[PDB]
Amino acid sequence: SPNIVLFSGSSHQDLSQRVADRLGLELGKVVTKKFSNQETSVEIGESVRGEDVYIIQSGCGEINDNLMELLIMINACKIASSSRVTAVIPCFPYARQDKKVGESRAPISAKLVANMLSVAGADHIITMDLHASQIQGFFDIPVDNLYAEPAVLQWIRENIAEWKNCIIVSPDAGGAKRVTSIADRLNVEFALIHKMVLVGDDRVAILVDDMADTCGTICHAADKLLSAGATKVYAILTHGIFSGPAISRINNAAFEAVVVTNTIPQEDKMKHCTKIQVIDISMILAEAIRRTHN
Amino acid sequence: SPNIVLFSGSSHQDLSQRVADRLGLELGKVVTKKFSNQETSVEIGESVRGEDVYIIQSGCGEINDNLMELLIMINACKIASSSRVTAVIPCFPYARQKVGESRAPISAKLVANMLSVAGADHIITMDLHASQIQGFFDIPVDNLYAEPAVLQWIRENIAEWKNCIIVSPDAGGAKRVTSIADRLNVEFALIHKERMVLVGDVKDRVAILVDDMADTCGTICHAADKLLSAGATKVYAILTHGIFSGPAISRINNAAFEAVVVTNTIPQEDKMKHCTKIQVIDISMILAEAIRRTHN
Amino acid sequence: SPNIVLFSGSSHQDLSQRVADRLGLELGKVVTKKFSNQETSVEIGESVRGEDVYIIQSGCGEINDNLMELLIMINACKIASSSRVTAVIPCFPYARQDKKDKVGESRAPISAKLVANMLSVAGADHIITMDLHASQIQGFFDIPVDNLYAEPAVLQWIRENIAEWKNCIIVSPDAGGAKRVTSIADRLNVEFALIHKERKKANEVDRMVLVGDVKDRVAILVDDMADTCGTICHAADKLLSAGATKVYAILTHGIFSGPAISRINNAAFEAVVVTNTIPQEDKMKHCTKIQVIDISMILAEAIRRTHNG
Amino acid sequence: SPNIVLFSGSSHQDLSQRVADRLGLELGKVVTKKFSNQETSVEIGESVRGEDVYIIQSGCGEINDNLMELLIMINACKIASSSRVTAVIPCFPYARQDKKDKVGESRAPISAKLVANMLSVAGADHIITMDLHASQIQGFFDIPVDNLYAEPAVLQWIRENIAEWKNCIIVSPDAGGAKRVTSIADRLNVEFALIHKERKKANEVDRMVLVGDVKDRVAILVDDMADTCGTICHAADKLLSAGATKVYAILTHGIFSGPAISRINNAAFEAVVVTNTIPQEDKMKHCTKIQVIDISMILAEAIRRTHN
Amino acid sequence: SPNIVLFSGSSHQDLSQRVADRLGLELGKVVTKKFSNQETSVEIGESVRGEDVYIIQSGCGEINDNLMELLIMINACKIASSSRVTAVIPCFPYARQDKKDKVGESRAPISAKLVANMLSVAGADHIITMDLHASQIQGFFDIPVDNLYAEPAVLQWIRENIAEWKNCIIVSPDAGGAKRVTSIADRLNVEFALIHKRMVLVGDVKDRVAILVDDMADTCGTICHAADKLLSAGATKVYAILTHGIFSGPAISRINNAAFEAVVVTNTIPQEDKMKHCTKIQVIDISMILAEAIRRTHN
Amino acid sequence: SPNIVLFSGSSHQDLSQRVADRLGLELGKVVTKKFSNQETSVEIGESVRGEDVYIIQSGCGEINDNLMELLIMINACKIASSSRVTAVIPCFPYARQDKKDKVGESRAPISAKLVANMLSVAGADHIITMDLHASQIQGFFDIPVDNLYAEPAVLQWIRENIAEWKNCIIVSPDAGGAKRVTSIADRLNVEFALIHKMVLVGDVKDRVAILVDDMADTCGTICHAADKLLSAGATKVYAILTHGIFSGPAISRINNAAFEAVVVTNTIPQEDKMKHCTKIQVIDISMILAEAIRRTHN
Ligand SMILES: Nc1ncnc2c1ncn2[C@@H]1O[C@H](COP(=O)(O)CP(=O)(O)OP(=O)(O)O)[C@@H](O)[C@H]1O
Ligand SMILES: Nc1ncnc2c1ncn2[C@@H]1O[C@H](COP(=O)(O)CP(=O)(O)OP(=O)(O)O)[C@@H](O)[C@H]1O
Ligand SMILES: Nc1ncnc2c1ncn2[C@@H]1O[C@H](COP(=O)(O)CP(=O)(O)OP(=O)(O)O)[C@@H](O)[C@H]1O
Ligand SMILES: Nc1ncnc2c1ncn2[C@@H]1O[C@H](COP(=O)(O)CP(=O)(O)OP(=O)(O)O)[C@@H](O)[C@H]1O
Ligand SMILES: Nc1ncnc2c1ncn2[C@@H]1O[C@H](COP(=O)(O)CP(=O)(O)OP(=O)(O)O)[C@@H](O)[C@H]1O
Ligand SMILES: O=P(O)(O)OC[C@H]1O[C@H](O)[C@H](O)[C@@H]1O
Ligand SMILES: O=P(O)(O)OC[C@H]1O[C@H](O)[C@H](O)[C@@H]1O
Ligand SMILES: O=P(O)(O)OC[C@H]1O[C@H](O)[C@H](O)[C@@H]1O
Ligand SMILES: O=P(O)(O)OC[C@H]1O[C@H](O)[C@H](O)[C@@H]1O
Ligand SMILES: O=P(O)(O)OC[C@H]1O[C@H](O)[C@H](O)[C@@H]1O
Ligand SMILES: O=P(O)(O)OC[C@H]1O[C@H](O)[C@H](O)[C@@H]1O
């Protein structure tokens, strides 16, 4: 008797209708405006009572507005007596830490967002490649942390002639688990960069990290990879935020291409950068939603 | 040995300092900045262990930015082992809101829960749009009133106050407007939009529209025009929270007001630059007393 | 396939059956009783497993006995593994507050919020109610609360029972009832008026001021409830001395406690009309002015709606 | 540091001021009435901010008005920013259960647990009560619960008031109070016995069984409370037909509902002794057999102990 | 439409399968082990989405590993989006309190309620258990708790195995099993007696078969001395019937040397290895009771 | 003013009294035993009312028992009306995982979050722990959690114990300790390399190699790692860990491994294992915990 109701806010209209087309359904009717004083207004237009409802919004643009907007729609479908409300958040906001010498720091912002999603009334969360997977434990809720790697792997094979050889390098220490894993799915060798010194060593170098925001490191990392004798250097990321200086710096850096997936709207930045190519994840999320709905 | 601690956000720094002056202390060092990707950042610069923390943040300007900042700073003081954390919210956001049934305040309630989930232990605000918002929490809430200062201003700035009339621009501020009447021994009038109709007698008397907030300001401008059509000598507009967004200031500039009075729960210095008819009432003392009281 | 079970408390049985009659079902077997030491006893007599339970009980009578009786059968249907328990509370208890000037600030609504938390902790999953004293009480919960209006019923009673309703005036007994009266006024496309008692001071006389004109019109005072009924009786007196042909009083909740019935028998009203969120039969037997408006359609349709669309 | 402000609800004012007298304090300014429509009103008259509040209300009279009155007063002192609120409930309401059989399972204590959850949600932080019908009720909370015993005062009354207490017999009126009597028995260095009324079957006659010997001995039945009192009256008669010189009854909680007074006026008790967890003043004016033990010192010290 | 899913833990494989058999099912695939560093590991082998899962685990053997295993498995099926997770706990752990009793008040059951809160936070939605040491433990949760009785099967065992049963006497080993003894006694229309500790006796056993009844039997001292006293009071025979037979250290050695006719327990706790050294122990099977309870809550 | 009260369990008697000495006080009276049926028993011997109590129990030994007893101790303290209860857990149990290679998604920390929720419901108000396998476990609570580092004491142990440390090389088995090796390395302005299965990237030829990671259990990875590190030229190989677990066949392995010393901290009882393995050396962290306890007590 519950049928899937699919919503979307203001954050990523394109991805949302893409998964709608993968599921065979239309987006639900909802009007999100902002009042003159900047208070977010969300009014549902469809009946969602007794339905399994999925609200898709990524933490990308004006996030605080997108996040507040998301919470308002979650609380709105919960007060409306829906059987279930699922937050589909491709890019989870506040996942990073801006961090000591003697102890760590509770991730107060990431756990604060978990608590607000929980109190708003969420009953399921679907997200992709979190900055730290242990954020699933910031919740007493099921959290699907889907990996984009198959997407990354197939894209390489399919797109890069030289993949069979090549080398995967991480721009940082913390990503090493990430390169390693991707490397051995290709039965391939690895190297890593640390702020600049490089470890490991005429191959197609491909830097892999979870997200790319200001992009400074990965550009200086590319400059060192070509100084270490690399044929080409690629940059493949899950979340492409490209804030500030980023696109200008990608405009002054020598990438064959920089690949990301569409957890974040990029078209308007594609128009300013010929490098960027985007992988479609409509089916992973689409498929994950359908799985959750049985 | 808790000591009072005053932290200010990005919303209303002048007001924060102003109550700090009233309490005789310094403000707590905190740097609030947004990251390149516009995520809010907060880094407290002092120790708050065993302290009575007070963060002064009004619901104004960039609302979701300001509230999210407030929540991050509250959490940061609770994970830091504060004795208590009190959110001072001069103008509470989202306070505002079918045949056959009523809607639920679902945003106000949502912010209540987000402040509670962040770790707030006490709330100090002023003039809630509905006093029952105190019940959206399970923690003490000191919904303060600006009337004392409004009656004082009225007596001391309107010559003919003994023979004025307090008018409510709507059908919901009635108990707010009779309150004033009873305290000035003056009558009130009520306006309804049905073409606006007025109930009451205004001919040859000074009319004073009073409400809690003014945002787009259309109802009070049209209300002034009718009150003058009913023969009112002068029109005042007295508001606790002066949001003044949109086309409002243009409207009061074209409006037949003698003056419009608001409180400093929201920054108004910028708006008076563009509007000579606005005047503000300091409520830094009201919040100051509420803090002192709550601190014991 | 979750089914639907209607339970009645003690407070208003008649309305429970009327909602049963409108839903096409009969009432679920439950025995409610007072022990010798006046301890509430609730034994439900039919299976509620996997069922959609609705318990109908109004905040009237011995308020605390009915409220505890309601909480116990909620927690009894909740421990017995029902799929959902909806508390249908036609008149919500503790909705008003005994404040009075607390100047410089307001007082927290401690009783209404405490009853909200007790309904929540008892195990309620949904709330239905009719005309809350303040709609923001919906926000005192974390579960869906439906506050229905009786306005449609008041408007149809008014059109079918008051001869010159076209030229009436809708009056509020107080400030704070202005929105309600205006609403009703615009709906009948008639105008409104307001009455404000000034607070007596040391050496005055009590006075009510009327803002608005009622001369030569049928006056209709409407508020959310009537309990002690002094304000509306003096309101009828003042409306008639302002030149009103008649005075009615139409409330959604008719509490009638203390001297109310004695006061209406001696007041100047044409009628005092209320809804059946509270049993009124034994009151009309002592007061011929009370008339009743049935609202079992609204509660019945809200129940049917809350079950399967 | 917080002081102690102590408040009395309507139910047992006399005992609250006895506890006040024991603590060297006076009761706090509070007005508790009823509105016309029977809603409870609680308005605190003094400041409780940063103080240690203790509210004494017993489970008696009109119980749901008193329980409601207790909860409203707790959440009123909690929202007023009290340092800590403690509910002193000498006789805890809804403690017993009307199960009166389950054959392959037991029933849940729905009412006692629900009252535990309402005290918790209202804002209670500590509970102090006396002789719970089941000690396990302490586990119905996530806050401390002090379930104090009246046994010292009962032993004291027995020694100073039963002439032949040295060879007295402690009797339990039921199977469940056995552990109770045992306790008392070994403390007086005397023996016990049990009364058990069997299920009346159709066509059988009312049959009560006595286990133990009470011949030529003073019998004293002992149970956590007394409410309608039928089982203990018949227990008296059975004990006397079994050759007991005298029968006493000592209960911690004297409810005395319904027909009890009349029952006891026609019962062959020498004395029915209870504690003052419930007002008894007006009952002794209709029953000369009722005698009260004061338990002010136990609650008084439990409070002083909780405050430090 | 959710189907019944039954899982079994380390504690009682036999009885688990045994209820699986009375239900017409097989257990679900679960693998359990303990890592080299002694940490409990659970890996469910089936999908439990949308399922009505039942986990059977008794408070026996090594209890903290069994209980923890139980909590990971509940807080494993619950996160896997099961329709509902039910803990089937035949013998509830930590149900008793170390009765070191302060003279003027009582002690709260801190361990039983602690076990209650950990089962609740793990994600349990229902609990099925048998003869709790105190029934009010049902009140340690805000979720439905089924406290099933073995007394039907005990009464039937008694009538069908003790020849002289119409004139026996139900006895209790202390002052807390009195209600229980009373209960079966009236069901059998038979008088009763109780022992309180010098050990004394209240009641008459002369020339009767005496049967000790209580919920659990552990180090067994009380029931052995109770047997000795009952025979000293002129009893023909002494039996001991309980629900949960824990039989910890010195117990087996104690009853082997005790004047018991037989000692009866249920299979809420595994015994067979205890029957290997003890010929007086006999087991009453209660798989039906749990089966009935599972099926009824599942509807 | 609340005094500070200290309790210890069965897990680490040695450590607990050391922090007691550093704080200038003695340990609290508590008898912990296990009933005949294996039911942990706790009985507090001293009044904790209105006091600030700290209970130290490590996820060492037989963990389920010590953790269950820890919970009993914390809840014994909460209903005894203690001013506050803080769980001092030097080595957090169930911190680790076995999720691995689910293709396309992670497995949630079901176990560590479960221990968090169990510590929270038991009544804990603060946690003091050291070197969590993942710092994000701090976020598994809503209460302050101090995840202290042992890195100061390891840096000073080396700087005073390895002669060839100005030019050393710091390394681990699989990358995952990278959020780690870097940190130790740059605090000495030193290069580094990492091992991943078996290959190694970086070069340590003719230099002292130093494996560092969080906890050692089985130890296979680090022994094979030590051997390969020689296969590439290091002068000597050391192994520096914080928690010294050494379960299963670890000690036989290290006795057969070519370490010049394997160094751990005393978050876990070591003495029994030092009598069987001469390569073990212990760094004492009682001061760090002492500072954290003292600092939260104000
Ligand atoms: N919104 C934000 N939140 C936290 N840090 C931010 C931030 N925006 C920018 N930063 C900056 O970006 C830096 C990137 O830090 P990272 O090393 O990516 C976090 P990490 O979790 O340690 O990654 P790793 O785990 O992959 O090392 C932050 O440390 C800070 O310097
Ligand atoms: N940020 C905001 N939140 C809610 N309403 C807003 C809003 N910004 C603009 N509005 C507009 O202002 C209207 C609400 O004004 P009111 O109806 O006076 C609030 P209310 O709570 O209904 O007042 P009451 O106290 O009179 O009921 C909205 O319906 C919409 O027309
Ligand atoms: N049960 C009750 N609760 C509160 N006040 C009661 C009462 N019974 C009688 N009263 C008295 O009658 C008065 C009626 O007050 P209400 O009108 O119910 C207050 P309100 O909730 O602020 O709403 P309003 O502003 O719409 O009038 C109370 O203030 C008090 O004088
Ligand atoms: N695992 C265990 N847990 C708790 N107590 C245990 C125990 N093993 C042995 N004991 C002891 O067994 C006794 C408790 O048994 P019981 O008295 O039957 C529980 P009770 O609730 O006090 O019983 P009662 O109803 O018979 O009075 C105490 O001496 C206690 O310390
Ligand atoms: N007691 C234990 N608990 C959990 N896993 C254990 C374990 N003992 C051994 N293991 C094994 O050791 C493996 C640990 O691998 P790790 O590399 O630590 C995964 P991680 O938690 O992501 O840490 P990393 O960041 O070091 O990768 C476990 O996944 C399992 O293979
Ligand atoms: O380069 P900046 O932003 O100035 O400094 C930090 C850089 O390092 C981070 O990983 C991003 O790549 C940033 O670009
Ligand atoms: O005329 P509008 O701008 O629509 O409304 C004017 C004011 O009245 C409205 O309720 C808002 O409060 C505005 O501030
Ligand atoms: O009724 P009285 O107490 O005389 O007046 C108080 C009025 O105010 C409330 O609105 C009641 O309904 C009462 O009418
Ligand atoms: O009230 P009664 O008819 O006596 O019998 C019920 C008895 O059961 C209880 O023990 C009460 O005290 C009552 O006596
Ligand atoms: O075993 P003992 O030390 O003699 O006494 C303890 C009694 O209580 C326990 O449940 C035992 O099994 C005994 O019956
Ligand atoms: O081969 P095992 O030791 O049994 O298991 C894998 C090893 O590798 C891991 O990092 C641990 O060190 C283990 O010891």
| Separation between Cα atoms, residue C92 and residue C225, nearest integer Å | 11
**Distant-in-sequence, close-in-space partners of A164: CB < 8 Å, separation ≥ 6:** none
C-alpha distances in Å from residue F195, one per residue of B272, C275, F132, F134, F172: 67, 80, 21, 20, 6
| Separation between Cα atoms, residue E194 and residue D10, nearest integer Å | 44
Asked whether residue F92 is domain-assigned, the answer is yes
Long-range CB contact pairs, C267-271, < 8 A, 24+? C267/C229, C267/C233, C267/C236, C267/C237, C268/C233, C268/C236, C268/C237, C268/C240, C269/C233, C269/C236, C270/C246
**Read out DSSP for chain B?**
---EEEEE-SS-HHHHHHHHHHHT-PPPPEEEEE-TT--EEEEE-S--TT-EEEEE--S-SSHHHHHHHHHHHHHHHHHTT-SEEEEEESS-TT-----SB-----SHHHHHHHHHHHT--EEEEES-SSGGGGGG-SS-EEEE--HHHHHHHHHHH-TTGGGEEEEESSSSSHHHHHHHHHHHT-EEEEEEE--EEEES--TTSEEEEEEEEESS-HHHHHHHHHHHHTT-S-EEEEEEEE---TTHHHHHHHS--SEEEEETTS--HHHHHH-TTEEEE--HHHHHHHHHHHH-
Contact D273, D252 (CB under 8 A): no
Radius of gyration of chain A (CA): 20
Q: Are residues C232 and C222 in the same domain?
A: yes
C61: left (phi over 0), alpha (psi -120 to 50) or beta: left
Three-state secondary structure of E134-160: CHHHHHHCCCCEEEECCHHHHHHHHHH
**Distant-in-sequence, close-in-space partners of B195: CB < 8 Å, separation ≥ 6:** none
Contact D255, D277 (CB under 8 A): no
| Separation between Cα atoms, residue E47 and residue E51, nearest integer Å | 8
Contact F129, A81 (CB under 8 A): no
The whole-angstrom distance between residue E40's C-alpha and the CA centroid of its chain comes to: 24
| Separation between Cα atoms, residue A63 and residue A116, nearest integer Å | 14
Residue identified by tokens 């006796």 is E201
Contact B238, B156 (CB under 8 A): no
**Domain termination residue (choose one: A123, A147, A171):** A147
| Separation between Cα atoms, residue C143 and residue F209, nearest integer Å | 61
| Separation between Cα atoms, residue C253 and residue C132, nearest integer Å | 10
| Separation between Cα atoms, residue F173 and residue F193, nearest integer Å | 10
HSE-CB at E293 with a 13 A cutoff on CA atoms is 28
Q: Are residues B186 and B255 in the same domain?
A: yes
Residues, chain B, total? 296
**Per-residue burial over D271-290, b = 16 or more CB atoms within 10 Å of its CB, e = otherwise:** bbbbbbbbbbeebeeebebb
| Separation between Cα atoms, residue C118 and residue D86, nearest integer Å | 19
Nearest alpha-carbon partner for C92 in C111, C69, C73, C72:
C111
Asked whether residue B278 is domain-assigned, the answer is no
| Separation between Cα atoms, residue A14 and residue A280, nearest integer Å | 11
Test mutation, E79, E83, E121, E125, chain A, max A CBs within 10 A: E79
Contact C77, C48 (CB under 8 A): yes
Question: How would you classify the pairing of strands E192-196 and E30-34?
Answer: unpaired
| Separation between Cα atoms, residue F128 and residue F145, nearest integer Å | 6
CA angle F207, F211, F215 (to 5 degrees): 170
Contact D109, E139 (CB under 8 A): yes
Answer whether D35 sits within 8 Å of C75, measured CB to CB.
no
C191, with CB counted inside 10 A (0-12, 13-18, 19+), is buried
Asked whether residue D165 is domain-assigned, the answer is yes
Helix ranges restricted to H, A125-186? 149-159, 176-185
Backbone angles phi, psi at E62, to 5 degrees: -80, 105
Query: Hey, what are C193's tokens?
Result: 């008026």
C-alpha distances in Å from residue B120, one per residue of B85, B87, E97, E194: 6, 7, 38, 57
CA angle B2, B8, B12 (to 5 degrees): 145
Query: Hey, what are D297's tokens?
Result: 């010192």
**Per-residue burial over C68-79, b = 16 or more CB atoms within 10 Å of its CB, e = otherwise:** bbbbbbbbbbbb
**Distant-in-sequence, close-in-space partners of E185: CB < 8 Å, separation ≥ 6:** E169, E170, E191, E192
Sign of the Cα pseudo-torsion (D274, D277, D280, D281, in order): positive
Query: Hey, what are B263's tokens?
Result: 């409180």
Ligand 1: list residues with CB < 6 Å: A 96-98, 131-132, 172, 174-175; B 35, 37, 39; F 179
User: CB-CB: which of F176, F181, F192 is closest to A177?
Assistant: F176
| Separation between Cα atoms, residue E279 and residue E262, nearest integer Å | 8
User: CB-CB: which of F49, F79, F80 is closest to D308?
Assistant: F49
Q: Are residues D107 and D184 in the same domain?
A: no
Contact D273, D284 (CB under 8 A): no
**Per-residue burial over E85-121, b = 16 or more CB atoms within 10 Å of its CB, e = otherwise:** bbbbbbbbbbbbbeeeeeeebbebbbbbbbbbbbbbb
Q: Are residues A123 and A15 in the same domain?
A: yes
Contact B54, B25 (CB under 8 A): no
**Per-residue burial over E51-64, b = 16 or more CB atoms within 10 Å of its CB, e = otherwise:** bbbbbbbbbbebbb
Nearest alpha-carbon partner for B135 in A78, C148, C94, D116:
C94
CA angle A122, A126, A128 (to 5 degrees): 140
| Local structure of D46: helix, strand or coil | coil
Query: Hey, what are B92's tokens?
Result: 């509470």
HSE-CB at E22 with a 13 A cutoff on CA atoms is 16
Identify the domain containing residue B229 by its residue range. 147-263
| Separation between Cα atoms, residue B266 and residue B256, nearest integer Å | 24
| Separation between Cα atoms, residue E134 and residue E137, nearest integer Å | 6
C-alpha distances in Å from residue B13, one per residue of B268, C63, E243, F288: 12, 49, 71, 40
Q: Are residues A128 and A177 in the same domain?
A: no
Q: Are residues D10 and D126 in the same domain?
A: yes
Find the helix or strand (DSSP H, E) in which D99 lies.
none
| Separation between Cα atoms, residue F130 and residue F133, nearest integer Å | 9
Ligand 7: list residues with CB < 6 Å: B 214-219
Asked whether residue C291 is domain-assigned, the answer is no
Give the number of the atom of ligand 5 that is nearest the alpha carbon of residue F98: 29
Residue identified by tokens 């010290």 is D301
Find the helix or strand (DSSP H, E) in which D127 lies.
strand D126-130
Backbone angles phi, psi at E11, to 5 degrees: -55, -40
Q: Are residues E36 and E69 in the same domain?
A: yes
Nearest alpha-carbon partner for A52 in A32, A23, A31:
A23
Asked whether residue F297 is domain-assigned, the answer is no
Which amino acid is located at B102 in the chain?
Answer: S
Long-range CB contact pairs, A163-168, < 8 A, 24+? A163/A204, A165/A203, A165/A204, A166/A203, A166/A204, A166/A205, A166/A206, A167/A191, A167/A200, A167/A203, A167/A204, A167/A205, A167/A206, A168/A206, A168/A207, A168/A208
Whether chain A has a CB inside 8 Å of the CB on C217: the answer is no
Q: Are residues B139 and B169 in the same domain?
A: no
Q: Are residues C212 and C116 in the same domain?
A: no
Q: Tally the domains of chain D.
A: 2
| Separation between Cα atoms, residue E188 and residue E226, nearest integer Å | 22
Mutate to test the pocket of ligand 9, among D97, D227, D253 (most ligand atoms within 8 A of CB): D227
Question: How would you classify the pairing of strands E126-130 and E84-89?
Answer: parallel
Find the helix or strand (DSSP H, E) in which A14 lies.
helix A13-23
| Separation between Cα atoms, residue C4 and residue C1, nearest integer Å | 10
B216 C-alpha to center of ligand 7: Å?
A: 5
| Separation between Cα atoms, residue D275 and residue C258, nearest integer Å | 38
Backbone angles phi, psi at E296, to 5 degrees: -70, -40
In this structure, what DSSP letter does residue E27 have? P
Helix ranges restricted to H, chain E? 13-23, 63-77, 110-122, 151-161, 178-187, 221-232, 251-256, 272-275, 287-298
| Local structure of C82: helix, strand or coil | coil
Whether chain E has a CB inside 8 Å of the CB on C80: the answer is yes
Query: Hey, what are E250's tokens?
Result: 């010195």
User: CB-CB: which of C108, C192, C196 is closest to B135?
Assistant: C108
Q: Are residues C124 and C47 in the same domain?
A: yes
Residue C282, Cβ neighbours under 10 Å: how many?
Answer: 10
Asked whether residue E250 is domain-assigned, the answer is yes
Answer whether E297 sits within 8 Å of C81, measured CB to CB.
yes
Q: Are residues D144 and D213 in the same domain?
A: no
Which amino acid is located at F15 in the chain?
Answer: L
| Separation between Cα atoms, residue C85 and residue C124, nearest integer Å | 6
Asked whether residue E54 is domain-assigned, the answer is yes
| Local structure of D173: helix, strand or coil | coil
Query: Hey, what are B259's tokens?
Result: 């003056």
Sign of the Cα pseudo-torsion (E290, E291, E295, E296, in order): negative
The whole-angstrom distance between residue E142's C-alpha and the CA centroid of its chain comes to: 22
Nearest CA in chain C to A80: C144
In this structure, what DSSP letter does residue F210 have? E
Give the number of the atom of ligand 1 that is nearest the alpha carbon of residue F179: 27
C-alpha distances in Å from residue F201, one per residue of A220, B53, B171, C159, D109: 21, 51, 76, 90, 66
| Separation between Cα atoms, residue E78 and residue D16, nearest integer Å | 49
Question: How would you classify the pairing of strands F52-56 and F84-89?
Answer: parallel
Q: Are residues D29 and D121 in the same domain?
A: yes
| Local structure of D50: helix, strand or coil | coil
Find the helix or strand (DSSP H, E) in which D230 lies.
helix D230-241
**Read out DSSP for C135-156?**
GGGGGG-SS-EEEE--HHHHHH
HSE-CB at A110 with a 13 A cutoff on CA atoms is 26
**Domain termination residue (choose one: F115, F149, F183):** F149
CATH number, domain of D217, equals 3.40.50.2020
Long-range CB contact pairs, D29-38, < 8 A, 24+? D30/D73, D32/D69, D32/D73, D34/D65, D35/C98, D36/C227, D36/C228, D36/C257, D36/C258, D37/C60, D37/C63, D37/C227, D37/C255, D37/C257, D38/C61, D38/C62, D38/C63, D38/C64, D38/C257, D38/D65
Query: Hey, what are C115's tokens?
Result: 């009853």
| Separation between Cα atoms, residue E230 and residue E209, nearest integer Å | 9
Sign of the Cα pseudo-torsion (A203, A209, A214, A220, in order): negative
Question: How would you classify the pairing of strands C207-211 and C191-198?
Answer: antiparallel
**Distant-in-sequence, close-in-space partners of A237: CB < 8 Å, separation ≥ 6:** A208, A209, A210, A211, A212, A258, A259, A260, A261
| Separation between Cα atoms, residue D94 and residue D106, nearest integer Å | 17
Asked whether residue D291 is domain-assigned, the answer is no
Sheet holding A167-170, edge to edge: A197-199, A190-194, A167-170, A204-212, A232-240, A258-261, A276-279
| Local structure of C166: helix, strand or coil | helix
Nearest alpha-carbon partner for D196 in D171, D179, D215:
D171
A293, with CB counted inside 10 A (0-12, 13-18, 19+), is middle
**Domain termination residue (choose one: F128, F149, F170):** F149
**Distant-in-sequence, close-in-space partners of B52: CB < 8 Å, separation ≥ 6:** B2, B3, B4, B5, B82, B83, B84, B86, B295
Give the number of the atom of ligand 10 that is nearest the alpha carbon of residue E246: 12
Binding site membership of C263 for ligand 8 (Cβ less than 6 Å): no
Which amino acid is located at C236 in the chain?
Answer: A
**Read out DSSP for A97-113?**
-----SB----HHHHHH
Percent of chain E that is helix, strand, coil (3-state, to 5): 35, 25, 40
| Local structure of D266: helix, strand or coil | coil
Residue E47, Cβ neighbours under 10 Å: how many?
Answer: 12
Question: How would you classify the pairing of strands D290-293 and D246-254?
Answer: unpaired
Find the helix or strand (DSSP H, E) in which F3 lies.
none
F216: left (phi over 0), alpha (psi -120 to 50) or beta: beta
Three-state secondary structure of C252-287: EEECCCCCHHHHHHCCCCCEEEEECCCCCHHHHCCC
**Distant-in-sequence, close-in-space partners of B250: CB < 8 Å, separation ≥ 6:** none
| Separation between Cα atoms, residue E146 and residue C119, nearest integer Å | 24
Which amino acid is located at E99 in the chain?
Answer: K
Contact D280, D254 (CB under 8 A): yes
Contact E242, E91 (CB under 8 A): no
Query: Does B84 count as an annotated binding residue?
Result: no
Sign of the Cα pseudo-torsion (B197, B199, B205, B206, in order): negative
The whole-angstrom distance between residue E129's C-alpha and the CA centroid of its chain comes to: 8
Query: Hey, what are D121's tokens?
Result: 């949600």
